[PDB]
Amino acid sequence: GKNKQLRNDFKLVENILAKRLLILPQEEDYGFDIEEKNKAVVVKSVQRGSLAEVAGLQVGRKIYSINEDLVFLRPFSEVESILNQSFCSRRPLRLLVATKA
Amino acid sequence: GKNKQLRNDFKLVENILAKRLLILPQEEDYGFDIEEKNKAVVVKSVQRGSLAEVAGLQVGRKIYSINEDLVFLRPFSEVESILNQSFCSRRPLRLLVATKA
DSSP states (O other): OHHHHHHHHHHHIIIIIEEEEEEOOOSSSSSEEEEEETTEEEEEEEOTTSHHHHHTOOTTOBEEEETTEESTTSOHHHHHHHHHHHHHTTOOEEEEEEOOO | OHHHHHHHHHHHIIIIIEEEEEEOOOSSSSSEEEEEETTEEEEEEEOTTSHHHHHTOOTTOBEEEETTEESTTSOHHHHHHHHHHHHHTTOOEEEEEEOOO
16 A cells, blocks of 8 residues: 555665765855756766765766655756856755666 | 755656556466566566556566566566566555656
8 A cells, every 4th residue: 555655665765766966065066067858856966086986876867856855846047046056055966867777 | 955855856767767557367367468678677578458558568678667566676577576566365465666768
């Protein structure tokens, strides 16, 4: 039932379909850029040598949540503001990112 | 925290990354075949005109769970036995299947 589905979906996401990354703020951003593809947000670029690369963030992967707020429920423009806001506040950035297909 | 992650992972799986299908048993099986690709189980073939096709099962998609038992935790051989066993018992087959990339 619903309870088993909750447990299964956690196991599936956390272990197979995605991983949790943490990136500290750098000079002007978190060392990466995002773009929209289909209705999903994906990493557009990662700055070579940055803490984003160090953290394991790879170009072309979907970002499923930023600080445990799901991305698919929001317009792309709100997701960019969330990222910019997080940066202006110099907080650690927590991401759930897709693993490889 | 963990509780938000549980809620988010459910929303993500149920709404974005997968769908739940139900297939009734037919003559000799459920109208489809499976194979292993990477470490994942995928649909190898769907019988044209079958209840599997009717149900919306598509060739090449991953099957993430069969009757709410996760596939990735098991060897492929156990997954085949689970399917065969389900069929011999003539039970409805419930699948969580990947949506399109």
